[PDB]
Amino acid sequence: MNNLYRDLAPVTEAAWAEIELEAARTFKRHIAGRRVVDVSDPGGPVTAAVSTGRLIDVKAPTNGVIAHLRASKPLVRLRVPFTLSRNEIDDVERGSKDSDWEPVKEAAKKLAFVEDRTIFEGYSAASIEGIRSASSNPALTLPEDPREIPDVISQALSELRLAGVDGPYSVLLSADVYTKVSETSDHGYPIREHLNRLVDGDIIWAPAIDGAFVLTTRGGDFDLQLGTDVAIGYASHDTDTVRLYLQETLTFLCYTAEASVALSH
Amino acid sequence: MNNLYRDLAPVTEAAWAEIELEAARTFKRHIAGRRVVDVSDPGGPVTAAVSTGRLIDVKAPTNGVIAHLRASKPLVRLRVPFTLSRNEIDDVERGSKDSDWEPVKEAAKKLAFVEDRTIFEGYSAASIEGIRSASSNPALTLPEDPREIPDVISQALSELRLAGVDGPYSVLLSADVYTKVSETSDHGYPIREHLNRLVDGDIIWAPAIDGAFVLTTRGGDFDLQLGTDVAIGYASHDTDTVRLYLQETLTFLCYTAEASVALSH
Amino acid sequence: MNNLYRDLAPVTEAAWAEIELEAARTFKRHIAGRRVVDVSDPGGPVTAAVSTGRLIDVKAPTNGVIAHLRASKPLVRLRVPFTLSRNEIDDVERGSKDSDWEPVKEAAKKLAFVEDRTIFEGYSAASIEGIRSASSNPALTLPEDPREIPDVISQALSELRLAGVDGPYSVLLSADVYTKVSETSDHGYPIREHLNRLVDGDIIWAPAIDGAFVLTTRGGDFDLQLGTDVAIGYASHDTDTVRLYLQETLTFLCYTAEASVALSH
């Protein structure tokens, strides 16, 4: 067995298939970051750091010796525990199709939110700079009126053009901004369609982020490094409940500072 | 023979084909519910209940014995009798093509209305909770002005987005609401087209329901269980008329409470 | 895995084989009901109810609609927990052949007693009518003197003959009555042999029932429906003991009211 200790969990095979399906579905729906960044293959469990290729000056060991430390970025392992009713698990073999997988959905939504907020806003404790912090283009303010959203977005499209950047540009919106441009309409279309006319990429719902992000998806600018992708593991169990977790280990690198514009309220 | 006792009816083969065609056509046109919910294969005549996979605590038979009743949902058999003129039946072999099949059409419309109102509004006596009652998302009020319909509908699309739900969303409208958004026009399109721009699913005419319903059609959320699909059976006959019926047996299950928004006036 | 969670139990393979053998043996010995009634194949875990094929009038949904609920019988799941010493379990791999399986035997005897008392005396909370309650033939009183038992039994054989019933008749006795007709002797035979001469079926020891039952085993009159047969499942464990359970889910149907005579003291 492995670190998931999956065979020790009192979960049947059919219940496991339903839990895997629910977690994978809810996660994909709430991920916006993997649609725009380069996603590496999983390095594996032993992978601990990503080389940046830079060098750090250290106090010379002896006379005439020049020493340099190799710089690297550590992976962070992110774990979201959740708790399942054993009655709901037992219902699945009897043929129930409405078993309560709400904790699985909440854990997948929380893991997806962490991953997206780590990619776009950073996680300083894990030495990850967000796309918002690593952007060299000027930051823009989103207006109160949703009918004035496409104007400011177009100004962001000016900045990537002034930065000398090609590629399909894509706009990612926070859930508040996505709702505002979805529910306001002008001439038989919502403002989301007006945003769709400005770019050759995609208007992407990004419920974890704040503000908005416009960026190129030409490739090679944004890199998500995975040691291991999302997995479900077993912690402990009692007569009534099974404690499990969702787990993934990653770091994020931004190679190109001028490939994005961040917007705030 | 079977319970339809079809060979006992004084109905010719050509008349039977015309009656089957008329009933099937009028039924499909008036069904909205089967277009959005999962529809099972017919279980058969012996099928009486659907297992939910839950357990009900009962008074212990003896000391040290723990007993539980299996929970289930009963099927309901729905029968709509109708009456045909025997002269109209006899006209069909002579080559008439305008035989009065209005009672067949009224029976098919009434059966379709019952089935749709059972799926969406429930039938408490049959222990069926409607989609409106089983929805956990907040209920919305439809405005008087049809030009303000797409706004509220978009708010419903916000709620499924706040519920963490994917899939093609579909909007079902009552006949009053469908007529209101069909006959009012803005900038060369009716408001029904404005509703069509908001979703990747379908604006569906639902003449049996009240208000409106917005919901996902990703699958696995709404389940209609059929023991036997719609069939035409023979009751009795006299010199002038044949009494027949339309009959179907079903139950409805909603597994996912947050997959729908109900709207009312 | 399944709902038994059998691989989570700290029970070795040899100990499992001994426990299965002990439980199966003690159960068969104490079952009288399955020898006389029709026993269905196991429906499976999803099976929750048995259709009776009857209809229940419900308040009409709308005008001109006739509604009927399908009638059914719910299954009941019967669970008997028991507790095993872990030292006795560990003794089995070392080659012990006298490991204390008394709790397994007591659980199997209690499960068998419940099943037989449910078949013959009913379980009202599970909507099961016993054979004694569902019998339309008159009830008889068993005499105090065991030498007068065969007389009354013969009167019961008159009643099934007056009911117009064929087939091998079988007599089931309570443990008190079986002991009384076993230990009293007349002319070199116990009274049990005198009972054996009256029928072409079998004198059956039935320690769970009260009184006596005479009935035909021609088939199709008494039906035991099993969702799942007897299984051993794992609940929880500590350093000293393993808590397990015996479990079976069933209902009982009597189709033929005149196929039996019940006797009481």
Residue numbers in the entry:
A (entry chain W), B (entry chain F), C (entry chain QA): 1 to 265
Quote the study on this structure:
Encapsulins are a class of BMCs characterised by their conserved subunit (Enc), which self-assembles to encapsulate enzymatically active cargoes and can remain porous to cargo substrates. The overall structure of Enc subunits across species with different T numbers is conserved and consists of a peripheral domain (P-domain), an axial domain (A-domain), and an extension loop (E-loop). T = 1 encapsulins of Mycobacterium tuberculosis, the causative agent of tuberculosis, and the closely related Mycobacterium marinum, are known to encapsulate the DyP as a core cargo with iron storage ferritin protein (BfrB)28 and FolB as possible secondary cargoes. In vitro cryo-electron microscopy (EM) single-particle analysis of the Mycobacterium tuberculosis encapsulin was used to obtain three structures of the encapsulin shell in intermediate states, as well as a 2.3 Å structure of the fully assembled shell.
All three intermediates have an even number of monomers, appear to be closed on one side of the shell, and miss subunits on the other end. All three stable intermediates have an overall icosahedral structure with RMSD values for the 48,52 and 54-mer compared to the structure of the full shell of 1.08 Å, 0.60 Å and 2.66 Å respectively, although the 54-mer is, compared to the full encapsulin, flattened in one direction and elongated perpendicularly to it. The 48-mer and the 52-mer differ primarily by the addition of two more Enctb dimers along the edge, around a point of threefold symmetry. Based on the predicted positive ΔG for Enc-Enc binding within pentamers, inclusion of dimers or pairs of monomers around trimers could be more prominent in driving these reactions.
